[PDB]
A paper describes a structure:
[name] [name] showed a canonical α/β fold characteristic of esterases, and [name] enzyme is dimeric. Two classical serine [name] motifs (GlyXSerXGly) can be recognized from [name] amino acid sequence, and [name] [name] revealed that [name] catalytic triad of [name] enzyme is formed by Ser106, His225, and Asp197, while [name] other motif is non-functional. [name] [name] revealed a prominent inserted α/β subdomain of 54 amino acids, from which multiple contacts to [name] aromatic acyl groups of [name] substrates are made.
[name] Ser106Ala-ethyl ferulate [name] crystallized in two forms (Form I and Form II [name] a dimer and a single chain in [name] asymmetric units, respectively). We focused our analysis on Form II due to better occupancy of [name] ligand in [name] active site. [name] electron density for [name] C2 atom of ethyl ferulate has missing electron density in our [name], which is consistent [name] this atom being part of [name] leaving group after hydrolysis. One oxygen atom of [name] carbonyl group that forms [name] ester interacts directly [name] [name] oxyanion hole formed by [name] backbone nitrogen atoms of Phe34 and Gln107, while [name] other oxygen interacts [name] His225 and an ordered water molecule present in [name] caffeic and ferulic acid structures ([name] ethoxy group of ethyl ferulate occupies [name] space of this water molecule). Due to these interactions, ethyl ferulate rotates slightly and positions [name] ester bond perpendicular to Ser106 at a distance of 2.73 Å. [name] ester bond is strained from planarity (bond angle of 116°), suggesting that [name] hydrolytic mechanism involves a tetrahedral enzyme-ester intermediate, typical of esterases. We observed a water molecule 3.3 Å from [name] non-carbonyl oxygen of [name] ester bond of ethyl ferulate towards [name] solvent-exposed face of [name] pocket. It is possible that this corresponds to [name] water molecule that is [name] target for deprotonation by His225 to hydrolyze [name] tetrahedral intermediate between [name] ligand and Ser106, regenerating [name] enzyme and releasing [name] product. [name] opposite end of [name] ligands, on [name] far side of [name] ester moiety, such as [name] ethoxyl group of ethyl ferulate, rests on a more solvent-exposed area of [name] groove and has few interactions [name] [name] protein.
Author numbering:
A (entry chain A), B (entry chain A): -5 to 244
The structure:
């Protein structure tokens, strides 16, 4: 605001869970604000999300970025997270943002699974959200769950197990049962305001076809395929994601 | 079981919320079990649900019935309940039931909004649930939310308010935004095992057309229209609901 600029820690609650977040506060009495959503197994402080927040703050766009339930510093077991309860987390964060008297326009920025959360939340609040940026939005998590193959971990899609060992973690069977029937595009398509879609051509985690499909469903979208970029826009690809996001929101 | 028959209190947790429930335990080493779901603003102990549980227990069918979040003895604010987080409550109760070593078949019985919870949960677990009974399933809550008229309380469906005073309570705007885009029939229709639909012809809360539509979408359903019955199968209508439910599950 006019008096404080910088980082602050924010905590919110959703159901019985504390959600821990970082606010970047820019200069100015009134400013726009982006809510930034991390991906599956990630956290609010990956290099990509910090550099997005930093870049927006440099153009006097505020941001908040929270750890989802089951991730980072927020409460809850990873095994109990689903895309649906992350959308509930997102709604709780939006409640916080939308009542801040400094905030003019609200934007959503989501990476990967956080892009599915962002796109679905904007479709539930198409009257309130003003712009959306999706970075490698993981809408393919649905098709993967229907196929019975989630990032190389295979199971019966017709009879999903109670829980699925997944790397060092345990993924809930309910995550997968929800994933299979998530109306990702149906809900997302209700947002008719501007959307920026950014996807790396060498993403091996989420096919760029996800973003090509969002670009088809959305009334007002712009698609950016980043030649050679991977799923996280790592290293020399990162500024492609940061620049496009910043430019779109200013 | 062979040694204890009667009532017990059960508590489960979902996210950070305690859910309080009543188990009716029948005689027998192995038995089927019904999970019974109450409606909007109701609780696990309405006369209808107690008499269902009692009648099933008399045919040695066990049951559990929990207060949803925001209701009865369970945790959470009513203002923060949605149909979606009740489905999350239902999944937590199913986790409990499906790991009980006495339970043979699992049935779902849901009244009104609890019927939407039941029908959607069965569509997420069509491999596990064996039979469903819906009593006046409130699938019209979706159409009502799209219309902007929820049990006589009117609002703009295009711009749902943050919260909606509703009788002595406060209904969350997010309940309504979720309601509008709930894929009730899409998810429910995935359950192809037997369903019993029971609806009163004089229900003024949820049109009998809801049950007529479920009867169309389901592969294996039986529809019972109870001439003169109201929304709760009150008083002299109650045994119609209790008898049909019991008969169907035995
Ligand atoms: C951390 C950033 O990346 C992620 O969010 C990717 C998520 C996503 C991809 C495909 C899947 O089948 C899936 O199922 C769990 C998840
Ligand atoms: C207690 C048993 O009855 C209920 O569950 C009925 C619920 C239902 C009916 C129509 C609605 O528009 C609605 O929106 C909140 C809720
Ligand atoms: Cl100020
Ligand atoms: Cl000043
Ligand atoms: Cl700082
Ligand atoms: Cl705080
Ligand atoms: Cl606490
Ligand atoms: Cl400005
Ligand atoms: Cl930094
Ligand atoms: Cl840092
Ligand atoms: Cl972490
Ligand atoms: Cl945690
Ligand atoms: Cl697709
Ligand atoms: Cl299994
Ligand atoms: Cl949904
Ligand atoms: Cl689809
Ligand atoms: Cl469709
Ligand atoms: Cl969207
Ligand atoms: Cl490509
Ligand atoms: Cl990853
Ligand atoms: Cl960068
Ligand atoms: Cl026993
Ligand atoms: Cl004995
Ligand atoms: Cl007793
Ligand atoms: Cl207990
Ligand atoms: Cl507690
Ligand atoms: Cl038996
Ligand atoms: Cl009693
Ligand atoms: Cl009693
Ligand atoms: Cl009560
Ligand atoms: Cl309560
Ligand atoms: Cl309908
Ligand atoms: Cl309003
Ligand atoms: Cl419909
Ligand atoms: Cl459809
Ligand atoms: Cl169903
Ligand atoms: Cl009728
Ligand atoms: Cl009522
Ligand atoms: Cl009775
Ligand atoms: Na500072
Ligand atoms: Na800070
Ligand atoms: Na603090
Ligand atoms: Na709370
Ligand atoms: Na808390
Ligand atoms: Na600043
Ligand atoms: Na200013
Ligand atoms: Na990440
Ligand atoms: Na972790
Ligand atoms: Na933690
Ligand atoms: Na925490
Ligand atoms: Na969790
Ligand atoms: Na925890
Ligand atoms: Na866990
Ligand atoms: Na403006
Ligand atoms: Na797909
Ligand atoms: Na899909
Ligand atoms: Na399929
Ligand atoms: Na498979
Ligand atoms: Na992968
Ligand atoms: Na595997
Ligand atoms: Na399954
Ligand atoms: Na497993
Ligand atoms: Na399915
Ligand atoms: Na669906
Ligand atoms: Na769903
Ligand atoms: Na979809
Ligand atoms: Na753009
Ligand atoms: Na990659
Ligand atoms: Na893949
Ligand atoms: Na395209
Ligand atoms: Na293209
Ligand atoms: Na488009
Ligand atoms: Na344009
Ligand atoms: Na393009
Ligand atoms: Na294009
Ligand atoms: Na372009
Ligand atoms: Na490029
Ligand atoms: Na490359
Ligand atoms: Na690189
Ligand atoms: Na940068
Ligand atoms: Na630069
Ligand atoms: Na007893
Ligand atoms: Na008891
Ligand atoms: Na006890
Ligand atoms: Na828990
Ligand atoms: Na608790
Ligand atoms: Na008994
Ligand atoms: Na026995
Ligand atoms: Na009731
Ligand atoms: Na109450
Ligand atoms: Na209470
Ligand atoms: Na409680
Ligand atoms: Na609640
Ligand atoms: Na409480
Ligand atoms: Na309340
Ligand atoms: Na059997
Ligand atoms: Na309707
Ligand atoms: Na409908
Ligand atoms: Na409509
Ligand atoms: Na209206
Ligand atoms: Na009414
Ligand atoms: Na009114
Ligand atoms: Na609305
Ligand atoms: Na209001
Ligand atoms: Na809509
Ligand atoms: Na939908
Ligand atoms: Na939804
Ligand atoms: Na529907
Ligand atoms: Na029947
Ligand atoms: Na009635
Ligand atoms: Na009505
Ligand atoms: Na019919
Ligand atoms: Na009929
Ligand atoms: Na049928
Ligand atoms: Na038959
Ligand atoms: Na009939
Ligand atoms: Na019929
Ligand atoms: Na009949
Ligand atoms: Na009748
Ligand atoms: Na009557
Ligand atoms: Na009567
Ligand atoms: Na009776
Ligand atoms: Na009798």
């Amino acid at each position: 605001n006019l008096y404080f600029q910088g980082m602050a820690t924010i905590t919110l609650e959703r159901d019985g869970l504390q959600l821990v977040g970082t606010r970047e506060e820019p200069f100015g009495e009134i400013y726009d604000m982006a809510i930034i959503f991390h991906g599956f197994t990630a956290n609010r402080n990956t290099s990509l999300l910090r550099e997005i927040a930093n870049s927006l703050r440099d153009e006097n766009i505020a941001s908040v970025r929270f750890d989802f339930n089951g991730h980072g510093d927020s409460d809850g077991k990873f095994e109990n997270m689903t895309v649906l309860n992350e959308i509930e987390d997102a709604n709780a964060i939006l409640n916080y943002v939308k009542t801040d008297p400094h905030v003019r326009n609200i934007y959503l920025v989501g990476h990967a699974q956080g892009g599915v959360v962002a796109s679905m939340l904007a479709g539930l609040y198409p009257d309130l959200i003003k712009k959306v940026v999706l970075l490698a939005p993981a809408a393919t998590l649905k098709g993967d769950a229907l196929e019975g193959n989630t990032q190389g971990v295979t199971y019966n899609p017709d009879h999903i197990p109670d829980r699925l060992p997944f790397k060092d973690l345990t993924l809930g069977g309910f995550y997968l049962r929800i994933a299979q029937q998530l109306p990702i595009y149906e809900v997302s398509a209700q947002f008719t305001k501007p959307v920026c879609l950014i996807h790396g051509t060498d993403d091996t985690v989420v096919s760029p076809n996800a973003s090509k499909k969002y670009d088809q469903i959305y009334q007002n979208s712009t698609l950016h395929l980043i030649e050679g970029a991977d799923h996280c826009f790592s290293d020399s690809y990162q500024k492609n994601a940061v620049n496009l996001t910043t430019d779109f929101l200013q």
